[PDB]
Swiss-Prot record, chain A:
Residues 387-407 have a biased composition (Basic and acidic residues). Component of the 26S proteasome, a multiprotein complex involved in the ATP-dependent degradation of ubiquitinated proteins. This complex plays a key role in the maintenance of protein homeostasis by removing misfolded or damaged proteins, which could impair cellular functions, and by removing proteins whose functions are no longer required. Therefore, the proteasome participates in numerous cellular processes, including cell cycle progression, apoptosis, or DNA damage repair. Binds to the intracellular domain of tumor necrosis factor type 1 receptor. The binding domain of TRAP1 and TRAP2 resides outside the death domain of TNFR1. Found in skeletal muscle, liver, heart, brain, kidney, pancreas, lung and placenta. It comes from the Eukaryota. GO terms for molecular function: enzyme regulator activity. One of its GO terms (cellular component) is secretory granule lumen. The chain holds residues 228 to 681 of 908 of the full protein. The gene is PSMD2. The modification N6-acetyllysine is found at K315. The keyword Kinase does not apply. It comes from Homo sapiens (Human). This is 26S proteasome non-ATPase regulatory subunit 2.
Curated annotation (Swiss-Prot), chain B:
Facilitates the ubiquitin-independent proteasomal degradation of stimulus-induced transcription factors such as FOSB, EGR1, NR4A1, and IRF4 to the proteasome for degradation. Promotes also the degradation of other substrates such as CBX4. Plays a role in inhibiting the activity of glucokinase GCK and both glucose-induced and basal insulin secretion. It is found in: Nucleus, Nucleolus; Nucleus; Cytoplasm, Cytosol. The chain holds residues 378 to 414 of 468 of the full protein. This is Midnolin. Contains three domains that function in concert to promote proteasomal degradation of bound substrates. Contains a ubiquitin-like domain (Ubl) toward its N-terminus that is necessary to promote substrate degradation. In the middle, two domains termed Catch1 and Catch2 are necessary and sufficient to interact with unstructured regions within substrates. The long C-terminal region associates with the proteasome. Interacts with GCK; the interaction occurs preferentially at low glucose levels. Interacts with the proteasome.
Length: 445, 37
């Protein structure tokens, strides 16, 4: 059922079964125990050290595969003490450090090391024949296609003459593509980004700070090079520089719930110099760092930042990132969020329905919905039909997929049918009818 | 222009120190693997 009364606790029934009924290696136990919101500290971290002596069989595998919230992998043995047999190898596995060197080993064995240019991917020779915009597209495409390979054919050879073919914010995103070209190469990628950290342009320097964040995304390095470089820019006088440093920290320290990174970021939302873009990117970065952790200082500072803002600032497009940072901090958490729905209820109409639907959607993601969805459905077709303001239920469709992402694939079996004979069959002008993102979000293959 | 020169000099000495620490950790990691094989 939808309510977290059997959905999130019926998972405890199989837990003993692994633990002591079938084989005791607990290799599948970690998988099963991740399901209950990946509580971990009181559910897994307390119940996988016991096996230990199956370090060659289960421990060698289950530890290395683990790629979720990461402190716990580095919370045992690792820097904790490493008394745990093979601590130093278990920490090198849980930290994903080997992505770069291990990923580049696979990339040599598959004979795919050679960098590809955007034109090879476009196949402009098979195309039967605003430069600022074009360059920007080819910068992102070069980044995505050569991601984590440590080598390209665009920014390596003549990258200064590539950056200055973009304009303004496009130079920030072109410089950031160097980070994402070397995604997970923390040790080599910093040396390629360094050349841009001393730029005479705030856009290029901010994009290089964002590149340092991107390179560390999903990899816990013992030297903390993301925190150690981005810290000094979080409260910077310049906005363009703030954005690159703050989003760089949010990408470098995602899932770590690092008090020393959060205490550096939380004051930026209250700074008089922060634009609504900087405040939104700060709440977003805090919500990525503290994802699913229910962090109280992130929750309170974001709720306060929403309550202190005028209805004229809450109408800026970037204000949508405040309840996103809030919803990410409570991702998976179904019970914990009624207090946050309650606190958000005080906000006026333009932001409250959007904020409440976004936080509720993030809490109870995955779980089959049959009754709350009815309300979601009843909060999906019957607001704008009889009122002047034609924006009240649009995002409700957006999150319709949320809570029905891959629920044993029969929700998707109907979700498209639910959306099939729906708004597109009879919807509205642009508000609800813009369910296009929903179909995309439904599946990723 | 002076503030940005002091800032870029502070950033530099931070990056040059981080690159040395990353290289030292990478060499320690490698030395453990190469001794196991």
């Amino acid at each position: 059922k939808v309510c977290l009364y059997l959905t999130s606790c019926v998972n405890y029934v199989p837990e003993p079964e692994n633990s002591a009924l079938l084989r005791c290696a607990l290799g599948v136990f970690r998988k099963f125990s991740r399901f209950p919101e990946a509580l971990r500290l009181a559910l897994m971290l307390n119940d996988m050290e016991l096996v230990e002596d199956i370090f060659t069989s289960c421990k060698d595998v289950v530890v290395q595969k683990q790629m979720a919230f990461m402190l716990g992998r580095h919370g045992v043995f690792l820097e904790l003490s490493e008394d745990v047999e093979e601590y130093e190898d278990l920490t090198e596995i849980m930290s994903n450090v080997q992505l770069n060197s291990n990923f580049l080993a696979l990339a040599r064995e598959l004979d795919i090391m050679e960098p590809k240019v955007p034109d090879d991917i476009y196949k402009t020779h098979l195309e039967n024949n605003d430069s600022a915009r074009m360059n920007l597209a080819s910068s992102f495409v070069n980044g995505f296609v050569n991601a984590a390979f440590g080598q390209d054919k665009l920014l390596t050879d003549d990258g200064n003459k590539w950056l200055y073919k973009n304009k303004d914010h496009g130079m920030l995103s072109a410089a950031a593509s160097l980070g994402m070209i070397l995604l997970w190469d923390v040790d080599g990628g910093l040396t390629q980004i360094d050349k841009y950290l001393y730029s005479s342009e705030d856009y290029i320097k901010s994009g290089a700070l964002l590149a340092c964040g991107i390179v560390n995304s999903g990899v816990r390095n013992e030297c903390d090079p993301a925190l150690a470089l981005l810290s000094d820019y979080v409260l910077h006088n310049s906005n363009t520089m703030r954005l690159g440093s703050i989003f760089g920290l949010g990408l470098a320290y995602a899932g770590s719930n690092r008090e020393d990174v959060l205490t550096l970021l939380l004051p930026v939302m209250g700074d008089s110099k922060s634009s609504m873009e900087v405040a939104g990117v700060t709440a977003l970065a805090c919500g990525m760092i503290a994802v699913g952790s229910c962090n109280g200082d992130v929750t309170s500072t974001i709720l306060q930042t929403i309550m202190e803002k005028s209805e004229t600032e809450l109408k800026d497009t970037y204000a949508r990132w405040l309840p996103l940072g809030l919803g990410l901090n409570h991702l998976g958490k179904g019970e914990a969020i009624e207090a946050i729905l309650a606190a958000l209820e005080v906000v006026s109409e333009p932001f409250r329905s959007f904020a409440n639907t976004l936080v509720d959607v993030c809490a109870y993601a995955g779980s089959g919905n049959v009754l709350k969805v009815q309300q979601l459905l009843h909060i999906c077709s019957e607001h704008f039909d009889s009122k002047e303001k034609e924006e009240d239920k649009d995002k409700k469709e957006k999150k319709d997929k949320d809570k029905k992402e891959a629920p044993a694939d029969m929700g998707a079996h109907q979700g498209v049918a639910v959306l099939g004979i729906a708004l597109i069959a009879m919807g509205e002008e642009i508000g609800a009818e813009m369910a296009l993102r929903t179909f995309g979000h439904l599946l990723r293959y | 222009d002076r503030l940005r020169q002091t800032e870029n000099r502070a950033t530099r000495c931070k990056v040059e120190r981080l690159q040395l620490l990353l290289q030292q950790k990478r060499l320690r990691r490698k030395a453990r693997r190469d001794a196991r094989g």
